[PDB]
Design a protein around this ligand. Structure first.
Ligand code: NA
Lengths: 10, 275, 100
């Protein structure tokens, strides 16, 4: 499963 | 016996031709198992391995939701990065992100990673402690301050040490026939004259899995690193890999040369000879 | 801006035997940026029946793709892969050499 948290715009 | 799960995301801007192209793929070791392409008709995360097909509707719905959220974030990022670097609309630019986790032979966590690149170069990466950032230039320092203030590393660490490892274990179990196999390379060397005084010696490895392999040439036991042409390990298309290494040698000297093959599938490393 | 040239390999999935079905592969790796044109050629002409893998990349950020088609080799038919990319000043043709 991929990440559902922690993936934020730079 | 060691294993990895990795997700790879690529977003490419296309000036005056619509929204950026977005592609996601996911791998366990050297076996792909999911994909998403923004240009495709389905707009779904899709299976690309037989053993992932058994996951139910909630899986596919949830993975599709996540990947679309990644797509939207990288869409914004292309705009932000053009601002950070004072770049125009005239050209196309590329963002890449890759993350995932490694486990050893006992399936226990070794390490986690999360790395981002802009236009083919390191931008920002999570350090090995999963608590701090390596920013590669001044613009990436801006991202670091923002990601520190937003506690992104804590979120990523929870994923990498928890969810990532748990799902890698499930996949390893469900796809055991494919994923926990080792196919030893079938090896041979070929010999062809390139003139009346020289010959190409090529060392082959075929039909192997996983992709990790070392092929080296020796002349009287000395490594011929600078004189060896080594090609990139390449997919046969059936789930196995191929690789060759070549040297050009004076005719008559073949018996001085040996090829050496190391792979996790071999009970012992092999030495192939011309005598 | 970083640009990296594709390393192109043209080869068959299994050891080729005339009259026995097989797959023809063109593997392009090591390239950046991702925009690339790859065609398999049979006696100089574009093969229509061609699939490719999903775009992925290596530890060093460079991209790779596999283009492939089912084929049945013969004595007379000549196969190749034609690749264009911003790093190549003209399209580059690599011929299939079954005797490597
Ligand atoms: Na070109």
């Amino acid at each position: 499963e991929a990440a559902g948290i922690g993936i934020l715009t730079v | 016996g060691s294993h990895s799960m990795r997700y790879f995301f690529t977003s490419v801007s296309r000036p005056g031709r619509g929204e950026p192209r977005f592609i996601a793929v996911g791998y366990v070791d050297d076996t792909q198992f999911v994909r998403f392409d923004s240009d495709a008709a389905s707009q779904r995360m899709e299976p690309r391995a037989p053993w992932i097909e058994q996951e139910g509707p909630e899986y596919w719905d949830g993975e599709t939701r996540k990947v679309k959220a990644h797509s939207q974030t990288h869409r914004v990022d292309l705009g932000t990065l053009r601002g950070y670097y004072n770049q125009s609309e005239a050209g196309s630019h590329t963002v890449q992100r890759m993350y995932g986790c490694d486990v050893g032979s006992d399936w226990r966590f070794l390490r986690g990673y999360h790395q981002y690149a802009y236009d083919g170069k390191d931008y920002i990466a999570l350090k090995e402690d999963l608590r701090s950032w390596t920013a590669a230039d001044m613009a990436a320092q801006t991202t670091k301050h923002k990601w520190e203030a937003a506690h992104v590393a804590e979120q990523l660490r929870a994923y990498l040490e928890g969810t990532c490892v748990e799902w890698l274990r499930r996949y390893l179990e469900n796809g055991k026939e494919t994923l926990q196999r080792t196919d030893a390379p079938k090896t041979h060397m070929t010999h062809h004259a390139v003139s009346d005084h020289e010959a190409t010696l090529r060392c082959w490895a075929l039909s192997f899995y996983p992709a990790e392999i070392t092929l080296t040439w020796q002349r009287d036991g000395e490594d011929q690193t600078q004189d060896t042409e080594l090609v990139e390990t390449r997919p046969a298309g059936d789930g196995t890999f191929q690789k060759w290494a070549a040297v050009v040698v004076p005719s008559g000297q073949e018996q001085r040369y040996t090829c050496h093959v190391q792979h996790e599938g071999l009970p012992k490393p092999l030495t192939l000879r011309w005598e | 801006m970083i640009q990296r040239t594709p390393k192109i390999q043209v080869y068959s999935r299994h050891p080729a035997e005339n009259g026995k079905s097989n797959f023809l592969n063109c593997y392009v790796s090591g390239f950046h940026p991702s925009d690339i044109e790859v065609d398999l050629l049979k006696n100089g002409e574009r093969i229509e029946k061609v699939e490719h893998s999903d775009l992925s990349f290596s530890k060093d950020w460079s991209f790779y793709l596999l283009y492939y088609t089912e084929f049945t080799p013969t004595e007379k038919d000549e196969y190749a892969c034609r690749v264009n990319h911003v790093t190549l000043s003209q399209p580059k043709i690599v011929k299939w050499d079954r005797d490597m």
